[PDB]
Design a protein around this ligand. Sequence first.
Ligand SMILES: Cc1cc2nc3c(=O)[nH]c(=O)nc-3n(C[C@H](O)[C@H](O)[C@H](O)COP(=O)(O)O)c2cc1C
Ligand SMILES: Cc1cc2nc3c(=O)[nH]c(=O)nc-3n(C[C@H](O)[C@H](O)[C@H](O)COP(=O)(O)O)c2cc1C
Ligand SMILES: O=c1ccc2cccc(O)c2o1
Ligand SMILES: O=c1ccc2cccc(O)c2o1
Ligand SMILES: O=c1ccc2cccc(O)c2o1
Ligand SMILES: O=c1ccc2cccc(O)c2o1
Ligand SMILES: O=c1ccc2cccc(O)c2o1
Ligand SMILES: O=c1ccc2cccc(O)c2o1
Lengths: 359, 359
Amino acid sequence: SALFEPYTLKDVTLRNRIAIPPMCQYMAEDGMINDWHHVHLAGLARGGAGLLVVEATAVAPEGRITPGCAGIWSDAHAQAFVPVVQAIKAAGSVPGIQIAHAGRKASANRPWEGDDHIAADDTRGWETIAPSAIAFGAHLPKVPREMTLDDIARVKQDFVDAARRARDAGFEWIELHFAHGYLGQSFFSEHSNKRTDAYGGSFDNRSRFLLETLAAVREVWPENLPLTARFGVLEYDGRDEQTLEESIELARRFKAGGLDLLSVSVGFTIPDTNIPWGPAFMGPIAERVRREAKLPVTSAWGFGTPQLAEAALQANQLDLVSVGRAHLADPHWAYFAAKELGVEKASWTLPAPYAHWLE
Amino acid sequence: SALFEPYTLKDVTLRNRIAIPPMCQYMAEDGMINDWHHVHLAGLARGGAGLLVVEATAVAPEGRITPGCAGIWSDAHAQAFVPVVQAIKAAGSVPGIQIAHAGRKASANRPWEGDDHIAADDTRGWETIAPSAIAFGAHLPKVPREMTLDDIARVKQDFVDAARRARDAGFEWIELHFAHGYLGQSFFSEHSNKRTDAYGGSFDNRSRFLLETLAAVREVWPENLPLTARFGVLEYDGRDEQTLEESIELARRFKAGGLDLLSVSVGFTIPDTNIPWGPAFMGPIAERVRREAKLPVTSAWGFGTPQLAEAALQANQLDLVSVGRAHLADPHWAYFAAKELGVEKASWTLPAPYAHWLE
Ligand SMILES: Cc1cc2nc3c(=O)[nH]c(=O)nc-3n(C[C@H](O)[C@H](O)[C@H](O)COP(=O)(O)O)c2cc1C
Ligand SMILES: Cc1cc2nc3c(=O)[nH]c(=O)nc-3n(C[C@H](O)[C@H](O)[C@H](O)COP(=O)(O)O)c2cc1C
Ligand SMILES: O=c1ccc2cccc(O)c2o1
Ligand SMILES: O=c1ccc2cccc(O)c2o1
Ligand SMILES: O=c1ccc2cccc(O)c2o1
Ligand SMILES: O=c1ccc2cccc(O)c2o1
Ligand SMILES: O=c1ccc2cccc(O)c2o1
Ligand SMILES: O=c1ccc2cccc(O)c2o1
């Protein structure tokens, strides 16, 4: 099956096309990960997936989404990832990490603790920053502070330091979080970016923060290790054709700038939208980006059904299939998929201590 | 459903009736467990099972089944279990451990490395000990050395030290491995025990090693923590009625001796047998033992089908349902079962970081 064919990008080879997309656990303390993450990630790596991308890890304290988000804004924070990275590699999976900055969606409660912006008097909260002083709305009403040019320079450097730390911690795959309405996505979208300086207005100006951050990270990230990003290419806000055209153009600039693969998603920049949720609904859009930008891609949402994952790959809509929630339900989803697709010696998708007894 | 009703034994309360039986991983080095076990066990504990019994852990070096078996024959070996025990508890599952001695089945290769007795010239091998100098046969042809009274005293003390270490490491449930043809089972069976001293011949003499070991362990194992054992009650060797009668009588002596629960299994003492393998095939025998010995029991083999587990409990054939291989296939089997049985808020069988998104 196509789902179980290896994939090589730069000097890295994934044993199959199954990728576990970044999934926040909200279990870190002051940005420091712990045994929750170690067992969670090591267990997933042993499950069989070819690539395991660690959850959105903040490049700065205020870049966290919640008080439970992981961070890599200091060398001590990076050190915490070392044993985890080594456990993922020992399991045969490729360790990746998504570095991010929540922007105006920062300083929010954990999903099961309100999922809304933290109250002004809560000692855990903090001031959010963004391209412009405009709130997301809905459950995230906090108005962020408009970033100064110095804030921009500082955040870009935070991304560079985060990438440098990821590199030294042993990660072999990096993903810049430019999607889901967080800082990067918000600089590109006219909904959230009303700036009149070099970082707002035109397509080039709105693209600037993302392109400069990618270029800056590229200086410290090894050429032989996949350099990727997640980016929302449309919002389903009634401006889809225009937005997709601009997003694809930016994807072309990313490719020219050294991006090896693009994780295609939706913007989630504003709440007033009408997203046509459905199993593998992103397939068609991902394929269009892959084709018009001539860049490898991955996407997600509902690919937890083996046959769907297989079909998406065979149709060349995606290069890697990202499966998220199915892996929270069953860390050994790769094994379940191998069986479902009739892969020979499907049990050996898992380590010997398990495989021997399941064959 | 009955599968998800809590269970209290002594001072310990299991959140449900799902027990993960001991399952050797063959990943230890010189008896020392490592991160394979830590992630494996912690992951299983987070999966939802109410009780997690750690694999057969050798009370002495020669008591290991293979060079990859876990051991607890020294305080350093016990220390290795401390972080694991604490991770299991943090997950809400009860940490248990099966202490054992492989007897004549010791010094064998890992299952995926031959599964047979290690060659005489292999530097990893060792002399096996047993009640009598008689080999198992088949793939385990090595003739063990007949134990002296001093060997018996020493092994009993090894079990005591192992239990004392398990206690101090934080385990809240202990299981003496008197089944599957290893040392304990071999002392009870006339197939393997041809001794003429106080430890062989009569029912009382063949029961002696097991009863004395239980009594000795009882002196160091807390009264408020479940004291259990796994025991093969029949062999399917043509002497079933006679063997079951004696096994049930020994179970009565175990109960009188402080045993809180008995894990009912098959002897596997010799290779020439005809075991009627089938889903939940042990159910009827387990029920007979539970009834005639008036002792709580658990059993296993094929209970990985939610409905079967539920049925066994409702029929009072078992008090706890042991599910093994299904947990190797899917560490979150408890979640799969909760869904299958229509349990309310089935996703919360798992921790919040997973449950929130699966509901
Ligand atoms: C708990 C949870 C945490 C997530 N965390 C992240 C994240 O940190 N970064 C990101 O880009 N997407 C994140 N996502 C979105 C997932 O990566 C994925 O695209 C989404 O779950 C859809 O795929 P699925 O249907 O296979 O779950 C998360 C989703 C869930 C359910
Ligand atoms: C890998 C593996 C390791 C096992 N290790 C042990 C052990 O250490 N001690 C024991 O008493 N039984 C052991 N067993 C037997 C299991 O506890 C259980 O009774 C058996 O797998 C039948 O249940 P199942 O059909 O749910 O897998 C093992 C079985 C497997 C497959
Ligand atoms: O699409 C999603 C859903 C949940 C989520 C959570 C944290 C960060 C993200 O980027 C997320 O993206
Ligand atoms: O892209 C680069 C630049 C410098 C460098 C130096 C050492 C090892 C690498 O992998 C490197 O990769
Ligand atoms: O891309 C880079 C740039 C600098 C560098 C320095 C040391 C090791 C690396 O792997 C590096 O990689
Ligand atoms: O029934 C079984 C099957 C495998 C096994 C492996 C180690 C120890 C045991 O007690 C076992 O018991
Ligand atoms: O059974 C016993 C005997 C002594 C003892 C001492 C401290 C704590 C315990 O739980 C104990 O339990
Ligand atoms: O059963 C026993 C016997 C002795 C003992 C000693 C300390 C702590 C315990 O928990 C103990 O438990």
